[PDB]
Design a binder for this molecule. Structure first.
Ligand SMILES: *C/C=C(C)/C=C/C=C(C)/C=C/C1=C(C)CCCC1(C)C
Ligand SMILES: CCCCCCCCCCCCCCCCCCCC
Ligand SMILES: CCCCCCCCCCCCCCCCCCCC
Ligand SMILES: CCCCCCCCCCCCCCCCCCCC
Ligand SMILES: CCCCCCCCCCCCCCCCCCCC
Ligand SMILES: CCCCCCCCCCCCCCCCCCCC
Ligand SMILES: CCCCCCCCCCCCCCCCCCCC
Ligand SMILES: CCCCCCCCCCCCCCCCCCCC
Ligand SMILES: CCCCCCCCCCCCCCCCCCCC
Ligand SMILES: CCCCCCCCCCCCCCCCCCCC
Ligand SMILES: CCCCCCCCCCCCCCCCCCCC
Ligand SMILES: CCCCCCCCCCCCCCCCCCCC
Ligand SMILES: CCCCCCCCCCCCCCCCCCCC
Ligand SMILES: CCCCCCCCCCCCCCCCCCCC
Ligand SMILES: CCCCCCCCCCCCCCCCCCCC
Ligand code: NA
Length: 270
């Protein structure tokens, strides 16, 4: 009974350990993660004036998302490098008992904060038609919260009880699907009576949103996408997971933000 190695990162780090390659790669990707968020922060601050007053709440929410993301992805970065330490004897990086162990808490918290704000911010750029601001807002915020919370629970049982890991994953996925359903409704109403240039950008937003957000359940499941014998159940699934999460974060926060800025600007022409 391995006791030291909560989550799969730890488990691997206690038993098999991490190649130089895996350790350093994961380090660097996480660093890139928070690097980009800091660049994002400056971008959204610096360009706030490029959109009409009435859209600026979207730029604001982007900046604030960037602040949270910088701070917590930085935390996550340092958490990674501190949780694992080199052993000359075996020539790999192993879970360090004198460190704090790898904690998903940082990222998941980032999600809890950022998800409501990301979902909200589009509603300051598009107009609804038949739907009510408050209804969409409440739907987003609730489902957003539930999705992240259920997932956070699930994540605990990842080593100890896969069956629960997945059932919580599934529950979370149900909330995810509702968010997709609502966001699609929003984008369609947002398209009504704007210029075709604006409808084009909204189309791209939908696709970015759909893809980027779907990366998350991917990275969650990543280590088990090959069986318990198979190839991803390894420091490789760890590498993959942290790569996909990072890609997702950048796309769903920074790029999403950029596109909305671009949408606002076209609405700022007709
Ligand atoms: C900026 C961060 C964002 C937009 C995070 C989004 C996170 C999710 C959409 C997570 C979704 C999950 C599932 C749908 C199933 C597995 C558990 C989660 C939380 C990873
Ligand atoms: C017309 C749209 C212009 C796109 C500008 C995008 C700027 C985003 C800045 C954040 C990404 C910078 C990456 C640096 C990582 C270090
Ligand atoms: C007029 C707006 C100027 C855009 C500068 C973008 C800065 C990117 C930060 C890295
Ligand atoms: C408006 C165009 C601004 C481009 C900003 C490029 C971001 C560079 C990131 C590296 C710092
Ligand atoms: C553009 C209108 C700004 C109103 C702020 C509403 C956001 C409150 C979030 C709580
Ligand atoms: C809503 C933006 C305020 C920042 C919240 C993130 C808290 C930073 C935590 C740093 C690591 C501890
Ligand atoms: C304005 C939208 C609300 C975002 C606040 C962050 C949610 C609190 C989680 C702690
Ligand atoms: C629903 C997600 C709840 C996130 C709360 C976890 C906060 C942990 C902060 C980082 C861990 C430091 C120990
Ligand atoms: C939605 C998950 C239903 C249970 C799947 C069975 C996986 C357990 C593997 C042993
Ligand atoms: C989408 C419907 C899911 C039904 C199950 C709800 C589970 C509640 C989660 C408890 C959180 C504490
Ligand atoms: C036509 C403009 C397309 C915008 C999508 C940009 C997404 C970057 C993909 C990485
Ligand atoms: C057909 C135009 C597609 C542009 C939308 C952006 C592409 C999705 C990027 C996925 C993020 C990883
Ligand atoms: C249906 C939306 C398409 C997104 C596919 C991305 C999910 C791949 C899972 C990561 C490996
Ligand atoms: C909502 C669940 C999304 C699962 C996508 C990952 C499946 C990848 C197929 C291999
Ligand atoms: C004409 C359409 C232009 C919109 C494209 C938006 C591209 C978003 C740029 C952010 C990508 C940052 C990734 C940095 C990784 C190095
Ligand atoms: Na170390």
């Amino acid at each position: 009974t391995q006791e030291l190695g909560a989550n799969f990162e730890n488990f691997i780090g206690a038993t098999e350990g991490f190649s130089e390659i895996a350790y350093q790669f994961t380090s660097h990707i996480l660093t890139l993660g928070y690097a980009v968020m800091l660049a994002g922060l400056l971008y959204f601050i610096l360009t706030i004036k490029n959109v009409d007053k009435k859209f600026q709440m979207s730029n604001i929410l982007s900046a604030v998302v960037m602040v949270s993301a910088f701070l917590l992805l930085y935390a996550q970065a340092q958490n990674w490098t501190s949780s694992f330490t080199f052993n000359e004897e075996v020539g790999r990086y192993f879970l360090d008992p004198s460190g704090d162990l790898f904690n998903n808490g940082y990222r998941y918290l980032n999600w809890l904060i950022d998800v409501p704000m990301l979902l909200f911010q589009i509603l300051f750029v598009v107009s609804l038609t038949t739907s009510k601001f408050s209804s969409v807002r409440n739907q987003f915020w609730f489902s957003g919260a539930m999705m992240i919370i259920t997932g956070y629970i699930g994540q605990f049982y990842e080593v100890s009880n896969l069956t629960a890991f997945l059932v919580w994953g599934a529950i979370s996925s149900a909330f995810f699907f509702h968010i997709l359903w609502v966001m699609k409704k929003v984008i369609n109403e947002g398209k009504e009576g704007i210029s075709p240039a604006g409808q084009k950008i909204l189309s791209n937003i939908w696709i970015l949103f759909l893809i980027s957000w779907t990366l998350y359940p991917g990275a969650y499941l990543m280590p088990y996408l090959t069986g318990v014998d198979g190839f991803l159940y390894s420091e490789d699934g760890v590498m993959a997971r942290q790569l996909v999460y990072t890609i997702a974060d950048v796309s769903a926060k920074v790029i999403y933000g950029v596109l909305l800025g671009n949408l606002a600007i076209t609405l700022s022409n007709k």
